[model samples]
Each structure stands twice: as C-alpha cells, then as structure tokens.
Target chain A: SKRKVVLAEQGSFYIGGRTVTGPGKFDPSKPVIRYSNEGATFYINQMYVNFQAPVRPRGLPLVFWHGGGLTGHIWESTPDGRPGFQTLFVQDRHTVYTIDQPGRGRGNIPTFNGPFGQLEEESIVNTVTGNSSKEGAWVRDRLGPAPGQFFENSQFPRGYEDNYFKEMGFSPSISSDEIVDAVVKLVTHIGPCVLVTHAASGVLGMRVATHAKNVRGIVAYEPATSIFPKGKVPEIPPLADKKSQIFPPFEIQESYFKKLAKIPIQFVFGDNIPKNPKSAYWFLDWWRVTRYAHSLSLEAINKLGGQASLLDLPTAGLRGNTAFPFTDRNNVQVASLLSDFLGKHGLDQN
Target chain B: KRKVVLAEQGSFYIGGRTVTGPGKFDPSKPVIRYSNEGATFYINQMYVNFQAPVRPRGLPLVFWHGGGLTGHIWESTPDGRPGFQTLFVQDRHTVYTIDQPGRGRGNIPTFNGPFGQLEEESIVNTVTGNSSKEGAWVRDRLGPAPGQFFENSQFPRGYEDNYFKEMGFSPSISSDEIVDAVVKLVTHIGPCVLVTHAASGVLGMRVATHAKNVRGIVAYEPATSIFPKGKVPEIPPLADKKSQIFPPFEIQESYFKKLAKIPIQFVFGDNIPKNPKSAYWFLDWWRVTRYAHSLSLEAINKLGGQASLLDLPTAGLRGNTAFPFTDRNNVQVASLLSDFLGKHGLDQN
Candidate 1:
C-alpha cells in the first residue's frame, strides 16, 4: 500500500497564563481544546496545544492511548458531545493527556520543520546519520528492505528509533519507546498518574509505565497481547545461541512487573467476536491467555514479594473489539474491576 | 412503635452505637419495631445470628455486589422485593448482603495511605486519563474528587473523613479495620444466609471458604479473575504488556483443581455478559456451562462440598440493585444452591 496521510486536528486552551494542550498538561473536566497536526510536503506539521489546570483541583493526571491505526480521538469523548475521556477522568478527579504516536495520529505525518524535500529514504539517511553519533546504525541498513516483505518507504515508521537504527539500518527517528519515555516523564512530573491503553497501543503504554518512574497504575482494555513480541526484530540464523539472539529481548521483559507491581492491573477482554456461541470459545480462548498472564504475574509478584491484584471478565463482552467507554455493562465491568484492584491496593483508604 | 427482639445463638456482638433502621431488631421476638443508628458493626468473629420478623417463613438469603459497588447493590430484587420469603427450612429463604473494602459503605478510607485502609478507591476514582474536574467522571465515592454526594456529610461519614484534617484519623484506613469493628455485631446474629453480586460475589465465596458457619454461598455475577475453568499465559515480564496470542487452556484446568476445594453455587444474569450467567449471541453457552459443570464435578469429589448453577435469561440480567430487587437474584440462586446441596447430603451443620 502506498504511504497514506493520517490527520489530527490541533488547538489550544489558555487558562491563567498556563498553556495546556496535546503533549502538554491540562484539565480534563472542562471542554477539550480542539487540536490537529498534518503531514507536510516533507514531514508532519507541528501541533500547538495550550491547556490550563482548573482552579478546583480535580484529581490525578491520566493519559489515554488510542489503538493502532486510530488517533487520540478514540478516547476523546462520547459522540453525544458529553464529557469525553477528559470529563470522565476529571469527574473522577484526574488531569487527562493524550498524544499521537508515530505511524498514526499527530505522530503519523512528518513534522513540517524537519530536513526539507526528503523522501522516506532521505528521512532514514538523516535520522540514521544524525543519531549514529550517539548510537550505531548497522540496524538501519538491514531494515532497509527485505525479501518477501511489504516494506513501505514512509515517514511513519513502526517500532523504536534506537532499535531500528541500531539493528535494521532503518529508523523512524523516534521509537515507540521514546514516546513512552516522554509519557512517563510527563506523568512523573505530575507526581501520580494513571495510564490506560487499548488495542495495539497498549504495548507502548505498558512500555512507558515499565520504564518510566512513579506511574500510579495501569488499565488495559481488550489489548491484543501479540503485538509487542511480534514487533521485535527476528533473530538471524546460524547463531551460537538462537534463543539468545531474539532481538530486543530485554524490551520484551515485563518491566511493569517490577515498577508497577504495587499498582493495580485490570484486563478487559471483548466477548463480541467471530460470533458468540461457537465463539464463546473465543472468550475463553482470549481469557485463557489473559488469565495466564495474570496468574503468571501474580505468581511473579508473590515470588518478588509484590502486591498487585488481578481481575478478569469471563463473559464481559464488548460491543466491538475496538469500541471504548464500553457500553454500560462493559463500562461497569471495567469500573468494577479497577475498583476492586484499587481497593485491594489500599487506594480506597481514607 | 412495635418492639422487635433479635435471637442470638452463635457468637454475635453489636458494638458500633450508630443505628440506621428502627432500633436493633431482636431475633427472639421481632414483632417490635427497631430504629437504625448510623453506627457501623464489625464481624471480628462470627457463628450466626438472626432477627426473626413477625413472620418466620421469610427466606434468609445473602447478597453480594460487583466491583466498586457495595451491599447497597443488593438492596432490592429485580421485581423490587426486599429479601426473600419462604415458609420453612424446606422453604427457607432470606437476603444477606455485603460491601467489599473499596466500594459503597465498605469502601476504604481515602486519607489512609498505603499502610492505612485500601486506597484503591481513591486511586480509581481520582486517577483519570482525562484531566478536567468538570470533565472528570466520578468513580467510587472515595475517588480523588469525592463528588458532591460523597462529600463529608454522607451518612457513612467516618468512612469518609478527610485525611487532610489532623483533627481525626489519618487517611488510608483499611476496610478490614471497619470489618474488625463490625465483626462483633455479626456474631450476635444466627444462621444467616450468604449472597454476593459481581466483584463482591467473589469475596462472598472467599468468606464461605474461610468462615466455619457460612451455610451456603450464592454468588451473582462474580467477577472472578481466574475461574476454575480459565487459564492464562506464562508470566510476562513486568515491562511485558503484550498479551498472549492464545488462551492458556492448561492453566485454567489447573486453576479449577484448587477452586473446587470450596463449595459455591453461581447465579448469573442472562442479559449481562459480564455477569457470567448472561448468554451472548456470539459466545458459546455450552462451553461456559461445561466450565461450570467441571466445577460441580470437582466439588462433588469432595466429601462435604456442594455446587450448583442457575442461569437467568428470563429474569433479564438481575444485577446489583436495592433490597427487593437484590432478593430477586439472590433468593433464586440461593434456593437452587441449597436444594442441590440437600440432594447431595450437604446440609447446614
């Protein structure tokens, strides 16, 4: 498929001299400031975001990640024009933040200010040559184009810049890890923050919390678990240790386990899939993996002496695999699961 | 006002002075009226206690709630009846409900930090991905904002005291503290029934497993993370957010091996997919039923264990509700469970 354009509108909100907007701090309870970012002849346009913290002091800060192929709007708000995610989180006492990552949303298009008149190849050359000063770039070249692989020469690159540039000789300049790192930095600056992720983006959110410091907790809804490991660079053949050669093996490490262990983890699986009755196996099948993750996580916690509670919905079905603010029942299930976890973690204390 | 007396047989004590209903009803002669004080009671220890009403045929059943909610969810039946009614043991029925630590009346205090009460409510309610107070959606009362109704003056205030105020207890007190405070009162009641909904339903099952005197467990839409029939992937690294590609069938089989140790009967809502009992058009019922059946088979293997399953499609997803409505789901589930137990030689000791 040819390179396509993913558009995101950008706007700003000025409150009491503080500019809060996308990739910045702002109050979620108030009406959201509309914003967008577009790809230019050479790169995506830079976005302008300005938001202010409300005087009343809501709660903590929260960041929502849209699914792969989707934009931040996935978590923005309900269609009736009611308080989207911002209102929901703020009413619950939290400041909300959302940003578009590479390959989609605001991050998909190249920033207008970068090296001009560059094709996909030029961007790679610039990013590789630029970052090689700090890291190596052998990985960028190997990633150039492969046999029987649909490799696109587009600015919106998948995976992290460091790994891409270092291993495959092809880099998106900014890696998914970098975005997550930025999210964590923002969250830590705000002190306590909640991170929620859906679909493929959950991998980045999880990565951010794991590497970032002081994340309060995490909630993942109907996340496709295969994305993370699958994205890792495949090992080359004829190696002394094939298992050891798994590229970015450390990236696959359960970082959330060590840092966010004390925090609560909630998993929401979609029941509306393939079809229900015969597909009930799908629910069980989905949970079989999720439950395994939870059990294994809890077991790891026990071994590590960590305190984290796990909850699952065997029958908690969603309207669609991609829908958010799940329908009432689904929403309640999500709310109840998180509530129980928070309660277990003593977050419900006076 | 009629004076009601409550019969106390098992180890029961009423400690907290605040009452809400009429005075405490007596089990001996419950004909009298009782006014309730706001005082909360703890079940430090318990056997069973009862407050016999004017009629003895009322069915004694237990009620549980989903996550984030409290015993308040089971306040009524779907048809709006409070508690269950039955003539005798063969027809015995009653309603019992509980509030888990972080939600409803049982929610953990906010002021109390990690060492204090459960702070999950504060974390859940207050922590939103969205950042506007106006846009903030309230979670449990203990959430970050502590919305208008849940503010300082709510009826259950001690549980809601502001930790910022040095004049009282620190924030973050655990629900167990309140439980310790309420257990004494529970012991004064005799041979009570057990019912649980959603998240709390799982706790009710846990309570039945540990509590020696619990006669039966009626779980409504229990939000159990690892059912006896479910499985999960191998433990992922802390940083590993990637979900497993396939469901862990083996692990679930292993999970049921341990869950079968306790006797529990399930009551599910038909329309509510998350309720476990609800049937989905796209999902398979026999598969889940098979899981339930496996649990029963495992339970049957035990000497004193019992298990039953009740699927409510006709009732239209009787979820957490006020008293009368709460009874609709609790009573049916409990009755069916008890009947199954009776047939299996498992009786109230």
Candidate 2:
C-alpha cells in the first residue's frame, strides 16, 4: 500500500510581456475614487509547476494548458469536487506544470490591448448545454426540457453555478500571437516537456511546439478550430467563392515541422460535437479541416521521419463523454489513457 | 410549486415457473436424505418506486435503465444532482422507476439460473469513450482525454467506484420472457409512457408490441440488435417507397402493425456519428442502427402511427449516458417528453 506523498520542488514563473502605460485619473479629494499611479510594467504569462515524486518518477515533465475562458484551475479540481489531472498525473509520478495564460487567472493585468467582447449567459448556456432555441426540438427530446431550460441529468456542477458563471466573466480575449509567444517561452524554460492543451489553447499549444525546440511531444485535447489552405483535400469541402475565412491559419512547413514529425503528437476530442448537431456541424467542420491539415503536417514531418496520431473518443468506443474529458466522471480513465500513450512513446516508465 | 408525495412504493415477482426439488424429511434426529419438496421458481423480479404531487398530468411514466445499470437511473445522479425521479414528480406526473429482472432490488433467487456478466473491458470502453472509432468525435467534442473537462457533461466524475459497484448482471432470458414480464407490469399498472435506455431499449420495443396499454415509448440511445433476429431488411428508395415491404420471416407484420398505433421516439446522443479518419468503418456500424430506427419509423407511419428520431447534440449526452434522466439534462428532457405525451392526449385529466 502507498501512503503519503511529497513535492520535490514547487515554483511559479511568468513569460512573454511588455511594459505599457495607459491614461490614469487621480482624485485626491474623493477617497472612493482615489488617484492611482498606473505605469508600464512587465506583464508575463503565469505558469505554476509542482514536481512530486514518492519514489522514482516516470515520463517526461507534463505541461498542461487550459482552454479559453479557463485558467489552470481546470487541472486542479473538477467542478464536481474531484481530483483533476494535476493530482492524477502526480499520483502517476509525472512532474506537472499548470499554466494560466496572460490576462487569465493569476496572470491578470490592469489593461489588455485587444478586441474583446462579453460572453452572454444565454449563448454560454446554449453552446455548452446544447439548448439553443433554433434546435429546440432536438434539445427537448435529449434534455427533456424546452430551450432555455436545464436538463436534470446534466453532469455540470450547478451547485457551483455562480462560480462557473464567474469563470466565464474572467475569460479574456487575447491575441493568439501573444499567447503563443508566452507558451514558447514557458516550453523553452521548462526544457523538453510534454505539452497538453485544451479547447481554444490548442492553437497556441501547436504554435508553441513549433516555436520551442524543447517540446518533446504534444497531446492536444480538442484544439480550437483549424484553418486550412484552399484547394486542399477537406473532409467536407468548403463552398467555392465563399466569403473570406474568419479564422487565420497557423501554417508551418516541412522545413520546420520536419523536426517535429519525429515527436509523437496526439489530437483528442470529446463527445461534444456529436451530441449537438449544430455543434456537430461546426465542430466536425473544423475537425475535418484540422484533421486534414494535421495529417498533411504530420505527413510532411513523417516524410522527413516523424510520428503522430489523431484520436477521436467516440471512434475509440469511448462514448457519452463531454467536451471536458479530464474532469468528466471518467477522468481517471482518461489520465490512464494518456499515461499509456506516453508510455508507448517512451515517455512513461510504467 | 406543488406538494410532492411518494404515492406508492412496492415490489413484485413475475415471469417464472414452479419447480419441485429434493429435500431432507426428518423428524427426531434430523438425519434425512432425499425427499420431495414443492417451491415456487420465479425468474424475474421487479421493484417499483412511484412518486407524484397533485393530480397526475400524464400516464404514469415507466422508466427502464440500460444493461449493467439499475432503477437508480431515475434516482439522484452520481454527481449529487437531482435525478429525473424528483424532476418528474415536481412536474406533476406519477413516475414509476423499476429495477428490471435480476437487477437492483429485483435480485434473482439463486435457484433461478447462472447469470451472464459483461466483460469489464467492453463496459469500460463503451461507457468511458475508448472503444468505437465514432467515439473519437465524442472525445473531440467533449475535450480530448486525460485531463480535459467539458462544462455540460452529465457523466459523474470521481464516482466510478460506487457507480461500478451498483452495476448488476442478468441471467440470459428469451425475448418472450422479457416481453412477458414487462407486459405483466404494464397490465397491472395500466397504460403508461415507456422510456428505455441503452440495452433495455430492445425490451422496450418488444414490450410496446405486446402490451396493449403502452401509450408511447422514448428510447435513449437504444442498442439496435433488438429490431430483427437476423439480417436487416433494406428500406426501399423513395421512388418505389409504396411497394417496399418488410421481410415477413424477419418480423411479424401484424405485431409491427400494432406498433403503428403507438407513437415512439428514438433518441440518439451527439457522439454517434463517425469522424473523418474512420468514417468508413464506423459509419457502416452507425448505418445499421440508423436503418433499424428508420425501418421502425416507416412501419409505424405506414400503419397510421407517428414516430420520429430525436438527435440530441447540445443536450450534452452520449452513449450509455445518453438517457436524459441520468444527468443534469434530465429535467429538460423529461419536460420535452411530458409535452409529447400531452400532444397525444395522454396527459388529459
């Protein structure tokens, strides 16, 4: 039996930021609206790392990147009051680092220069729960309520509804370029660690891997929608003469990714797309593009000698999982799956 | 809000035979060997939990959980959330959640027979999103495995040990045995809205065919093997639609025609579709399930009965957990079905 565990080293750091001065007003007479001195200071992406080992550790250091509108908290404790991947990875004896990208969580700053918009409660609910008015019938049939209602069977921790809603408010809209720069720095400092990214951070994760030479492997969990070049083979071809593509491409070539092709990169998706047809259309469309692009990217790398894989949970016979696989009821199973993947890649010892 | 009531809670045994076995017959010393003794041999037992508040708005809602699961499906969720049982009661409907034969409180007597157990790997792969290629789409949408968490997932995390412990096994039973038990229950309970999940879905369809009192059926990601015994019949193209007929040997046309009178809704979760990487392999399997439902829908429609398929994508449900009553999405889905019942006048006072 195993008893007790200790962290060998625990620390935090920040990466990629610059000094910026913004207009400030001072009201010395009014105490409530006091004058504040706001000047340019360094703002860097925050990363927290905990290296725990009871005995000898297995696998390369694992770096976790949270999705959009989320912080490193996604890897700490599940919304349902369970140990998240951080604990699971530690228990499995892997040094883990959790990140809160710039302007999110502990990386918050006074001002972030970028186009940002508020996320409405209705849109958030519809997108996450699949309860849109347009798809009212399907939603009702699946959730047992009409549009704008909660399904009693939902695994979402509504008991912490306020906290969940607050997290949405904390979600920051930042430029991908800035985020990728921070990721590249973090990976470079950490030295040849496994990169695991989720949702919106998937794009940044891939970019970081490409930019940082130390990235040994990548495990992307439903990376954001991908952009592909025109005239490429797509799962669902886009309509010719369509309007300009809103999403920009994070393109790389054989010259650079060829070095990455030798490293194992696994793409993972949850049960979100198939559950919501609208989500399915949107996500599957993106998935098709991303899958094709990654295949080509990996193909080029493999041509130069590399290894990569794309894993879809449903196709693997893992059904009923939601968008967040790590925090789902079967999070441990997912952790074990990743451990196994890493083991196959010669990263894990056992 | 209305005052909620437990209404009725009881258990019963159904669908088994009587058997006489050898026993010891001794008086003084209690040293006796073979002697004949009579005893009742019941195979399947069912436990029912009914709850309601105020007058019932619809026929009693009959709930059936999937394979390896129990009537707990209608109870509190694993994540400590209110289950369909509570929500349905609040909605003013008499809810009947049952532990099917040889499951939960419906435990089978030892003398019944050997029970078949599902392989752990199979169950794990199916429930955890690790087996099918199509499941990758689910993994993709739900968030990639190992450490991603979707906000709307209904699967309870950190409760696997308890949940797995609650799983039950069943003795192999003939279709007639299953249909007979459910038919008997429906007969005693009167007409009701039958809702089935996963493995029990086939039983739900069969019960609907035999039970005259069944008002309607809502199947949540039901396994497709229940449709025909052997090869699946091909659905005719729209051009020759009227002339296309189901194979007589495969199914009884009369029994299927009876289904026409009952409105049935087959609900599928979002993760059933195949991804591009393994589309050919997975889509072939998906087509079978789809074809099964399509054929059933066609049969019902031809008989002047209404039926349709309800695909839940945003409902945040997938395989095994696709049933609406088990997660946070339970109330919304129950409301939908309740309204469906209302449309057919089954909810009339």
- All candidates' chain B TM-scores are 0.44, 0.74
Backbone clash numbers for all candidates listed: 190, 78
Error of 1 at B16 (Å): 64
Residues B26-100, model 2: lDDT tens digits: 111111111122212223435444544455676888888876455555655544455666667667778777766
What ranges in model 1 sit over 4 Å off? A1-55, A79-83, A111-121, A125-174, A226-257, A272-302, A314-350, B1-349
lDDT of 2 by residue, A144-252 (tens): 1222344444434435432222222122235567767767876777677899888678767766776787888889886654523333324433312132121344555
What is the per-residue lDDT of model 1 for residues A1-350, given as tens digits with 9 covering 90 to 100? 01111111111210011111222333222122121111111122221111113223444455676654334433432222222343344334344565444423223222111222123233421211111110111111111222112123321123333211111111124445545554555555556666777755565666676666566667776554422222332332212221211122223544444555556656555332222112212222233343344344445544555554343343443232222433222343355555555456544332
Q: Which number leads on TM-score? A: 2
For model 1, the docking class works out as incorrect
Model 2: per-residue Cα lDDT at residue B94: 80
TM-score of 2: 0.41
Q: Residue A290 of model 2: what lDDT? A: 45
